[PDB]
Design an enzyme around this catalytic site. Structure first.
Site: not given
Ligand code: HWJ
Ligand code: MN
Ligand code: MN
Length: 174
Positions: A61, A89, A115
Protein backbone atom coordinates in the site's frame (compact mmCIF):
# COMPACT_ATOMS: atom_id res chain seq x y z
CA UNK A 1 -13.17 22.55 6.38
CA UNK A 2 -11.93 21.58 9.80
CA UNK A 3 -11.69 18.02 8.48
CA UNK A 4 -9.12 19.02 5.94
CA UNK A 5 -7.18 21.01 8.58
CA UNK A 6 -7.43 18.11 11.02
CA UNK A 7 -5.78 15.74 8.52
CA UNK A 8 -3.10 18.29 7.92
CA UNK A 9 -2.49 18.61 11.66
CA UNK A 10 -2.64 14.89 12.60
CA UNK A 11 -0.84 12.92 9.87
CA UNK A 12 2.66 13.48 8.68
CA UNK A 13 3.23 15.14 5.35
CA UNK A 14 4.24 11.97 3.53
CA UNK A 15 0.98 10.21 4.44
CA UNK A 16 -0.98 13.36 3.60
CA UNK A 17 0.80 13.73 0.24
CA UNK A 18 0.50 10.07 -0.60
CA UNK A 19 -3.21 10.27 0.27
CA UNK A 20 -3.64 13.43 -1.80
CA UNK A 21 -1.87 11.94 -4.79
CA UNK A 22 -4.08 8.88 -4.72
CA UNK A 23 -7.18 11.06 -4.64
CA UNK A 24 -6.10 13.71 -7.15
CA UNK A 25 -4.79 11.30 -9.80
CA UNK A 26 -8.27 9.73 -10.01
CA UNK A 27 -9.96 13.18 -10.05
CA UNK A 28 -11.16 13.38 -6.45
CA UNK A 29 -10.72 16.64 -4.63
CA UNK A 30 -9.59 15.97 -1.04
CA UNK A 31 -11.15 19.34 -0.09
CA UNK A 32 -14.63 18.03 -1.02
CA UNK A 33 -14.26 14.32 -0.17
CA UNK A 34 -12.74 15.15 3.20
CA UNK A 35 -13.98 11.96 4.93
CA UNK A 36 -12.47 9.84 2.21
CA UNK A 37 -9.21 11.82 2.57
CA UNK A 38 -9.19 11.22 6.35
CA UNK A 39 -9.92 7.48 5.86
CA UNK A 40 -7.22 7.02 3.28
CA UNK A 41 -4.73 8.78 5.65
CA UNK A 42 -5.89 6.62 8.55
CA UNK A 43 -5.57 3.44 6.60
CA UNK A 44 -2.14 4.38 5.14
CA UNK A 45 -0.88 5.15 8.58
CA UNK A 46 -2.09 1.86 10.02
CA UNK A 47 -0.37 0.14 7.13
CA UNK A 48 2.92 2.02 7.73
CA UNK A 49 2.71 1.42 11.45
CA UNK A 50 2.13 -2.27 10.92
CA UNK A 51 5.24 -2.65 8.70
CA UNK A 52 7.28 -0.63 11.15
CA UNK A 53 6.58 -3.15 13.88
CA UNK A 54 8.81 -5.61 11.92
CA UNK A 55 12.16 -6.05 7.93
CA UNK A 56 9.40 -8.64 8.47
CA UNK A 57 6.91 -6.83 6.18
CA UNK A 58 6.89 -5.51 2.63
CA UNK A 59 4.61 -2.52 2.36
CA UNK A 60 2.53 -2.75 -0.79
CA UNK A 61 0.00 0.00 0.00
CA UNK A 62 1.08 3.56 -0.69
CA UNK A 63 3.22 2.74 -3.69
CA UNK A 64 2.10 3.67 -7.16
CA UNK A 65 0.52 0.66 -8.91
CA UNK A 66 3.48 -0.18 -11.17
CA UNK A 67 5.70 -0.48 -8.09
CA UNK A 68 3.08 -2.34 -6.02
CA UNK A 69 2.64 -4.91 -8.79
CA UNK A 70 6.41 -5.08 -9.25
CA UNK A 71 6.75 -5.80 -5.55
CA UNK A 72 3.90 -8.36 -5.50
CA UNK A 73 5.24 -10.00 -8.63
CA UNK A 74 8.79 -10.14 -7.27
CA UNK A 75 7.41 -11.75 -4.11
CA UNK A 76 5.40 -14.36 -6.08
CA UNK A 77 8.35 -15.48 -8.24
CA UNK A 78 10.75 -15.78 -5.31
CA UNK A 79 8.32 -17.57 -2.91
CA UNK A 80 5.79 -19.50 -5.04
CA UNK A 81 2.79 -17.93 -3.23
CA UNK A 82 -0.25 -17.24 -5.45
CA UNK A 83 -0.54 -13.83 -7.06
CA UNK A 84 -3.49 -12.02 -5.46
CA UNK A 85 -6.15 -10.56 -7.74
CA UNK A 86 -6.06 -7.18 -6.11
CA UNK A 87 -3.23 -5.37 -4.46
CA UNK A 88 -3.06 -6.32 -0.79
CA UNK A 89 -1.44 -4.04 1.83
CA UNK A 90 1.62 -5.96 3.13
CA UNK A 91 3.59 -9.15 2.62
CA UNK A 92 4.67 -11.11 5.66
CA UNK A 93 8.06 -12.82 5.14
CA UNK A 94 7.73 -14.72 8.46
CA UNK A 95 4.37 -16.36 7.71
CA UNK A 96 4.88 -16.13 3.95
CA UNK A 97 1.53 -14.51 3.17
CA UNK A 98 0.01 -11.30 2.00
CA UNK A 99 -2.01 -9.22 4.41
CA UNK A 100 -5.02 -7.07 3.74
CA UNK A 101 -5.45 -4.46 6.43
CA UNK A 102 -8.93 -3.12 7.24
CA UNK A 103 -9.84 -0.13 9.35
CA UNK A 104 -13.50 0.27 10.14
CA UNK A 105 -15.92 2.56 11.89
CA UNK A 106 -18.48 -0.32 11.97
CA UNK A 107 -18.43 -3.72 13.73
CA UNK A 108 -15.17 -5.54 13.00
CA UNK A 109 -16.86 -8.84 11.98
CA UNK A 110 -18.96 -6.91 9.50
CA UNK A 111 -15.89 -5.36 7.90
CA UNK A 112 -14.00 -8.63 8.10
CA UNK A 113 -16.76 -10.32 6.04
CA UNK A 114 -16.71 -7.58 3.44
CA UNK A 115 -12.98 -8.02 2.96
CA UNK A 116 -13.16 -11.82 3.01
CA UNK A 117 -16.03 -11.69 0.53
CA UNK A 118 -14.01 -9.38 -1.71
CA UNK A 119 -11.01 -11.78 -1.51
CA UNK A 120 -8.02 -15.90 -1.74
CA UNK A 121 -4.82 -16.89 0.21
CA UNK A 122 -4.60 -13.41 1.75
CA UNK A 123 -4.51 -12.88 5.50
CA UNK A 124 -6.97 -10.30 6.80
CA UNK A 125 -6.54 -8.07 9.85
CA UNK A 126 -9.27 -5.56 10.68
CA UNK A 127 -8.93 -2.78 13.22
CA UNK A 128 -11.65 -0.53 14.50
CA UNK A 129 -11.58 2.82 16.26
CA UNK A 130 -12.85 1.07 19.38
CA UNK A 131 -9.88 -1.18 20.10
CA UNK A 132 -11.48 -4.18 18.45
CA UNK A 133 -9.75 -6.18 15.84
CA UNK A 134 -10.37 -9.35 13.94
CA UNK A 135 -7.97 -11.42 12.01
CA UNK A 136 -7.96 -14.54 9.88
CA UNK A 137 -8.13 -17.61 12.14
CA UNK A 138 -7.67 -15.28 15.15
CA UNK A 139 -4.04 -15.10 14.19
CA UNK A 140 -3.13 -11.47 14.87
CA UNK A 141 0.37 -11.65 13.31
CA UNK A 142 1.78 -8.91 15.52
CA UNK A 143 2.57 -9.02 19.15
CA UNK A 144 0.24 -7.36 21.60
CA UNK A 145 2.25 -4.19 22.11
CA UNK A 146 2.40 -3.36 18.40
CA UNK A 147 -1.30 -4.05 18.08
CA UNK A 148 -1.96 -1.90 21.13
CA UNK A 149 -0.03 0.94 19.55
CA UNK A 150 -2.17 0.74 16.36
CA UNK A 151 -5.35 0.73 18.37
CA UNK A 152 -4.16 3.60 20.51
CA UNK A 153 -3.37 5.64 17.41
CA UNK A 154 -6.78 4.82 15.91
CA UNK A 155 -8.67 5.58 19.07
CA UNK A 156 -6.76 8.91 19.31
CA UNK A 157 -7.74 9.79 15.74
CA UNK A 158 -11.34 9.15 16.70
CA UNK A 159 -11.12 11.33 19.76
CA UNK A 160 -9.34 14.10 17.96
CA UNK A 161 -12.09 14.05 15.32
CA UNK A 162 -14.60 14.11 18.12
CA UNK A 163 -12.81 17.12 19.78
CA UNK A 164 -13.36 18.89 16.45
CA UNK A 165 -16.99 17.64 15.96
CA UNK A 166 -15.93 15.64 12.88
CA UNK A 167 -16.43 12.15 14.26
CA UNK A 168 -20.22 11.82 13.65
CA UNK A 169 -19.77 12.72 10.02
CA UNK A 170 -16.69 10.55 9.72
CA UNK A 171 -18.43 7.55 11.33
CA UNK A 172 -21.47 7.59 9.05
CA UNK A 173 -19.51 7.88 5.77
CA UNK A 174 -17.90 4.37 5.61
C1 HWJ B 1 -9.07 3.55 2.89
C2 HWJ B 1 -10.08 3.42 1.90
C3 HWJ B 1 -11.07 4.38 1.89
C4 HWJ B 1 -12.09 4.33 0.95
C5 HWJ B 1 -13.02 5.27 1.02
N1 HWJ B 1 -13.89 5.58 0.06
N2 HWJ B 1 -14.59 6.48 0.61
N3 HWJ B 1 -14.18 6.72 1.87
N4 HWJ B 1 -13.24 6.00 2.12
C6 HWJ B 1 -12.15 3.28 0.01
C7 HWJ B 1 -11.17 2.29 0.01
C8 HWJ B 1 -10.14 2.36 0.95
C9 HWJ B 1 -9.19 1.34 0.96
C10 HWJ B 1 -9.14 0.53 2.09
C11 HWJ B 1 -8.23 -0.51 2.20
O1 HWJ B 1 -8.21 -1.19 3.25
C12 HWJ B 1 -7.37 -0.72 1.13
O2 HWJ B 1 -6.49 -1.72 1.23
C13 HWJ B 1 -7.42 0.06 -0.02
C14 HWJ B 1 -6.68 -0.09 -1.17
O3 HWJ B 1 -7.10 0.54 -2.12
O4 HWJ B 1 -5.77 -0.95 -1.34
N5 HWJ B 1 -8.35 1.10 -0.11
MN1 MN C 1 -6.44 -2.35 3.27
MN1 MN D 1 -4.61 -1.63 0.10
Amino acid sequence: MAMEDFVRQCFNPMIVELAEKAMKEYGEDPKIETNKFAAICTHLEVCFMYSDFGHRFEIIEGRDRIMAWTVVNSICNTTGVEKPKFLPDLYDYKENRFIEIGVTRREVHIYYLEKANKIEKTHIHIFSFTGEEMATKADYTLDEESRARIKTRLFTIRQEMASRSLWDSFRQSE
